Each structure stands twice: as structure tokens, then as C-alpha cells.
Symmetry: C3
Subunit: 118 residues, 3 copies
Amino acid sequence: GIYGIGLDITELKRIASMAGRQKRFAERILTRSELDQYYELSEKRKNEFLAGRFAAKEAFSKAFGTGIGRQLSFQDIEIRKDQNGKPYIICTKLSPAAVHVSITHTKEYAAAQVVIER
Amino acid sequence: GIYGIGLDITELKRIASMAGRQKRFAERILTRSELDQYYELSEKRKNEFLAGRFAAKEAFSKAFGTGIGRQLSFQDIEIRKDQNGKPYIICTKLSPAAVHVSITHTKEYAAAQVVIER
Amino acid sequence: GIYGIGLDITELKRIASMAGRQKRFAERILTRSELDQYYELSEKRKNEFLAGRFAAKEAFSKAFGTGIGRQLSFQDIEIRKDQNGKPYIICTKLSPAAVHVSITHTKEYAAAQVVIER
Ligand SMILES: CC(C)(COP(=O)(O)OP(=O)(O)OC[C@H]1O[C@@H](n2cnc3c(N)ncnc32)[C@H](O)[C@@H]1OP(=O)(O)O)[C@@H](O)C(=O)NCCC(=O)NCCS
Ligand SMILES: CC(C)(COP(=O)(O)OP(=O)(O)OC[C@H]1O[C@@H](n2cnc3c(N)ncnc32)[C@H](O)[C@@H]1OP(=O)(O)O)[C@@H](O)C(=O)NCCC(=O)NCCS
Ligand SMILES: CC(C)(COP(=O)(O)OP(=O)(O)OC[C@H]1O[C@@H](n2cnc3c(N)ncnc32)[C@H](O)[C@@H]1OP(=O)(O)O)[C@@H](O)C(=O)NCCC(=O)NCCS
Ligand SMILES: [Ca+2]
Ligand SMILES: [Ca+2]
Ligand SMILES: [Ca+2]
Ligand SMILES: [Ca+2]
Ligand SMILES: [Cl-]
Ligand SMILES: [Cl-]
Ligand SMILES: [Cl-]
């Protein structure tokens, strides 16, 4: 069955502001594997990539049932992708299984949803 | 398996307008348990809370397969939350089981999604 | 279980622009059955209908795992609806089973989500 679901719509301007005020904001949100992908992008694409991963992790934290905080850090969640470019999540604290995720972008937002199966 | 899924993105300004034109709009959308939580909020938070519950119930009505109308009222759906703050839905007309739901907020919208299992 | 999930938020203005620049844009995105429904709408409703179907098909392509391209065309996906107005998807290339979908509209967007079961 389904353990939990999560949805999030993140504001591009907020992510850009936090990145502009905190020199290491991206390192706070992304894992090393995620950063390897992030570092190759333009200033604009970096913001969209980061906002989408931020939305995916907040959505995951809702499906997990705790939100981001004492029980779950942004660093405990990793978005990976298969050979076709389809994203999926790995949260070792949960299990080794792939968790369902989908991301979408607009002019002002980066949105994502997650479904964790039993 | 999955009985149905539902998604909704509600406009904060529309909800605020309806609440401003109808003195009992919140009572139309929310159950007594939901209102107990609503009454404790500021004018601004009330609007966001109400818009999110409205989105969650419209999303539920889509997963249910009928929409809001003759077969389903906003009063037949209740959003509850566990000790961690995770929301879930109860629709007695359907079954006593918890229905999956997730909510997210932006500057102009309150959005939600629902998944009803078999 | 779940084979895949997909989410998409499409910009109404972009869809209107493509339809204004390409005389056969609707025919590119919609199947014959979908067009039969589209042709009956006003200019404004046509745009909203088309944007919602576009979002639903992009969401489906993400759940399918390939995106829209060489392995999947907009024409391979069809949104149908039951007697209550609830939409569902049929992708013959996948299987004859109904695929879960939900659509929602705002002032500037048409959004959709999809869940494909095993
Ligand atoms: C849940 C979380 C991930 C997102 O909260 P947010 O950004 O404030 O708000 P969102 O609008 O995206 O989500 C709001 C909703 O989460 C849902 N929620 C709250 N706790 C939850 C939990 N434990 N499980 C699932 N959903 C939960 C609620 O329904 C709530 O909306 P509501 O108050 O109208 O019912 C929160 O734990 C959080 O922000 N974590 C801290 C991270 C942080 O401070 N980051 C700074 C940048 S590095
Ligand atoms: C489905 C419902 C919940 C939401 O409709 P809405 O606000 O007009 O529109 P939304 O943009 O959020 O959703 C539109 C979509 O619902 C989906 N829909 C319609 N009937 C449906 C049903 N029975 N089951 C599942 N989905 C359905 C459709 O795909 C439709 O978009 P489309 O016409 O492009 O295919 C509708 O039944 C409703 O508005 N109920 C009446 C409530 C009301 O009048 N409230 C006033 C405030 S108190
Ligand atoms: C995936 C697709 C459907 C949508 O992509 P898009 O419009 O460019 O962008 P969206 O913002 O909606 O989706 C972006 C996300 O798709 C997800 N994605 C990419 N490939 C994917 C795949 N194979 N399976 C599932 N998800 C995938 C990604 O996470 C990506 O965001 P990210 O780069 O931050 O990780 C793409 O295949 C596409 O646009 N198809 C071509 C259709 C076209 O050119 N149409 C013109 C109009 S007729
Ligand atoms: Ca958020
Ligand atoms: Ca709605
Ligand atoms: Ca906007
Ligand atoms: Ca898209
Ligand atoms: Cl945000
Ligand atoms: Cl609305
Ligand atoms: Cl778009």
C-alpha cells in the first residue's frame, strides 16, 4: 500500500534570496551527488535546479510524516535519476527502496510531489 | 490498490472575497473540529487555513469521483492531524480509514492533493 | 503497487501563444475524441481545456518514465471521462487499464497529476 504522500510548491524568488544571503545555502540543501550536478549549471539554472530539489525534499518530508527538522534533514534525502532522466528519491534512513517523485517548473515556481509505498 | 486521486490549487484572494461577502462562509466549508482550530487564528492565517482545507476537500471530491455537490458536501469531509502535525482525511460516508492528503502554501495559492486507497 | 507518478503545471499564456502561432497546434496535442470535445468550446475555454490536457499528458509522460519524445507522443495518450465527469487516462501502448489523473485550474495555470499502477 501507500505509507504517505507529499506535495510542495516552492517560490523561485525566495530560493534565490536565500542563496544570495547565505554563501553556502546550496550546500545546506543538496547532497554531494546533487551538488555535482548543480555546479555545472548557469546562475539561472542553478536556482531552478535547487528550488526543485528543495520542493522535492519538502514533499518527501511530508510523505515521511515529520517535516524537515529534528527527525529529518535535507541531507538525509537524495534525488537520483535513471538513464532516461526520470527522478526518484533515496532516503537511507527509511529503506533502500526507490521513492516516487515528480518535478515541474513554471515562471515563478518549482513544484514536486512524492509517494512512499509500504 | 488505488481507488482515486485528486489535485487542487485554490486562489487565496477568491477565498478571502467569499469570506468577506458571506458572514458564515467558514462555517459552510469547515466541520466543527476544523473550526475549533480556525477560530484561534489571525485574519491572515484564517484565510490560509480555510483555503488549504477548501483545496483539500475539492481534491478529495475528485478522488471520490463526484466533485462537490448532490453526492458530497464539504461537511462530509474532515481534515485531521496526527501528533506530528501530518494531515489526513476522514470521510465517514466512504469508510473509517484514513485517506492520504498533503497541503502546500504559496504567496497566492493554497494547494492540496489526495489519494484514496481501495 | 505503483509503476510511476507524474506532476505538471502548465502556463495558460504559453499554450495560447503556441495556438496563435500554429494553426494546427490543438491537432498536435489532442486525439480525435478529445478534439470532438474541444471544438464545442469558446476561445477562452478551448485554451483552458487544451492547457489541462497538455498538463495531463506531460504528467503522464513523467509517470511513464520517458517524457514526450521518441518513445511517447501526445497522440499516444487519451483523457476520457466517466458519467460523473471524472477524468482518467488510456495509453494503449502501456495497457488497456485506466490510469489515474486529476486536473485543476487557476487564473494563470492548468495543472495535473497522474499515477500509473503496476
Ligand atoms: C512541512 C515543512 C517541510 C514545510 O513547511 P512550510 O514551508 O512552512 O509550508 P508549506 O506551505 O510548504 O506546507 C504547509 C503544510 O505542511 C503540512 N504539514 C505540517 N507538518 C507536517 C508533517 N509532520 N507531515 C506532513 N505534512 C505536514 C500541513 O498541512 C501544513 O499546511 P497547514 O498548516 O495549512 O495544515 C516544514 O517542516 C519546514 O518548513 N521545515 C523546516 C525547513 C526550514 O526551516 N528550512 C529553511 C531553509 S534551509
Ligand atoms: C470538481 C469540483 C470540486 C472543482 O471544480 P472547479 O472549482 O470548478 O474547478 P477545478 O479547476 O478545481 O477542477 C476542474 C476539473 O475537475 C475535474 N472534474 C470534474 N468533475 C469531476 C468528478 N466528478 N471527479 C473528478 N474530477 C472531476 C475535471 O477534469 C475538471 O477540469 P476540465 O474541465 O479541464 O477537465 C466541482 O464539483 C465544484 O466546484 N464543486 C462545487 C463547489 C462550489 O460551487 N463551491 C462554492 C464555494 S462554497
Ligand atoms: C518531461 C517533459 C514532458 C516536460 O518537460 P518540460 O516542459 O521541459 O519541464 P517541466 O518543468 O514540466 O518538467 C521538468 C522535469 O521533468 C522531470 N523529467 C525529465 N525527464 C524525465 C523522464 N524521462 N521521466 C520523468 N520525469 C522526467 C525532471 O525532474 C525535470 O525537472 P529537473 O530538470 O529540475 O529535474 C519533456 O519530455 C518535454 O517537454 N517533452 C517535449 C514536448 C515538447 O517539446 N512539446 C512542445 C509543444 S507541442
Ligand atoms: Ca514548502
Ligand atoms: Ca478548485
Ligand atoms: Ca502568479
Ligand atoms: Ca510542463
Ligand atoms: Cl518557498
Ligand atoms: Cl479558487
Ligand atoms: Cl507551460
